[PDB]
Paper text:
Domain antibodies are the smallest (11–15 kDa) antigen binding fragments of immunoglobulins.
In both cases the complex appears to be a symmetric dimer of VEGF with two molecules of Vκ·dAb or VH·dAb bound. A more detailed view of interface between dAbs and VEGF1–107 shows that Vκ·dAb interactions with VEGF are concentrated on complementarity determining regions, whereas the framework of VH·dAb is also involved in the paratope. The N-terminal Cα atoms of the Vκ·dAbs (these present at the C-terminal junction of the Fc region with the dAb in the full-length VEGF dual dAb) in the co-crystal structure are ∼70 Å apart. Such binding could explain one of the peaks in the SEC-MALLS analysis at high ratios of dual dAb-VEGF. When considering the end-on mode of engagement, in silico modeling studies demonstrate that it is highly unlikely that the two VH·dAbs at the N terminus of VEGF dual dAb could bind simultaneously to a single VEGF dimer, although it is possible for the Vκ·dAbs at the C terminus to do so (2:1 and 4:1 input molar ratios of dual dAb-VEGF). The top half showed reduced affinity, largely due to a more rapid dissociation rate, whereas the bottom half showed very similar VEGF affinity to the full VEGF dual dAb (data not shown).
Author numbering:
A (entry chain M): 1 to 107
B (entry chain W): 13 to 112
C (entry chain V): 14 to 108
D (entry chain L): 1 to 108
Write the structure that this text describes.
């Protein structure tokens, strides 16, 4: 099993701020990592797949990067709707392991 | 020995690779001349993205110039400079086709 | 500018690293999805610069690679698969 | 014009012997070299082209090697009908040019 280590655990930011979230994989997973947005009592929404490719209908201020063991999700200019918990998932090896998640909070 | 899985993946994953390209393909209009060599070595996007919805494509292009012999059969030839398209960077972009 | 001589030499019939889809080399097994979907093999490439000649392999061997075999939903496993590569190539006449 | 320097001018050999003729091009011509056999009262007969590829109907005791500037014709075992003059010809650039030829004679 691959261990996904996500940081930070939680963070507080203001509207308009740039936000950066990281995942490390315990061993090489190539580019095959997804990022999900999960709001309380709802379905997780797929934001990015293959490391840096936006799912359709996701705003451009979302972006991803990385290949191998180290990945990053950046939100360039934060919006009130973007306050949520964000999860990374790897899909190189079965089972598809997740990161602990990061809670993006209002200041 | 045996090529480890991680290496097979990385070496095949999309990137610019030396590819042998036929000149008549890159210049299908030219009718009188015959080219020697008939084919040239060009860096071009190749490999797999590992996703049916993604395809490999060039994001950075350039030009290179090569001396190609241009022959009018049974008459003569000259060595002419000819420019060919190259691919400097390749990325896996989503297709244009409707989602299956 | 690349000199004609080097152009010719570099594009002349020879074994060149080539990226081959696995489904070409194994079209009988549609049950599995392969990953990666394509592998790097030495195969004959180039031109002979003679209308009546063609580049063809004259020495072959098998190479073995770890590939992930993916049953759509049930599961996946990395096993060994062997592929044909070309060790020496030659311009030989067509018929 | 590309100059082809053939050598030697003349050989004496016995039936069964191994014969080795060389041809040098003044400039690089890749593999685009032909060898011809020439006998009295006939048109020259193409033995080898593309450096090393035997023409159809030519005995296998004839071989050719080399690429670029230095070439070789070999006859592994000379037969009576092989005594003749042999020539190289480059066909990379027009005009196609010939060697001065090697005359292969019977030893007396």
């Amino acid at each position: 099993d691959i261990q996904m280590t996500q940081s930070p655990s939680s963070l507080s930011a203001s509207v308009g701020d740039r936000v950066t979230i990281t995942c490390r994989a315990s061993q090489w997973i190539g580019p095959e990592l997804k990022w999900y947005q999960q709001k309380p009592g709802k379905a997780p929404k797929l934001l990015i797949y293959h490391g840096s490719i936006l799912q359709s209908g996701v705003p451009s201020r979302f972006s991803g990067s990385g290949s191998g063991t180290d990945f990053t999700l950046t939100i360039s200019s934060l919006q009130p709707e973007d306050f949520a918990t964000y999860y990374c998932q790897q899909y190189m090896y079965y089972p598809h392991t997740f990161g602990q998640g990061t809670k993006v909070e209002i200041k | 020995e045996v090529v480890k899985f991680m290496d097979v993946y990385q070496r095949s994953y999309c990137h610019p690779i030396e590819t042998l390209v036929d000149i008549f393909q890159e210049y299908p209009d030219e009718i009188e001349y015959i080219f020697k060599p008939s084919c040239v070595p060009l860096m071009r996007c190749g490999g797999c993205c590992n996703d049916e919805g993604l395809e490999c494509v060039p994001t950075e292009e350039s030009n290179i110039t090569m001396q190609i012999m241009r022959i009018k059969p049974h008459q003569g030839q000259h060595i002419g400079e000819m420019s060919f398209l190259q691919h400097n960077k390749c990325e896996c972009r989503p297709k244009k086709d409707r989602h299956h």
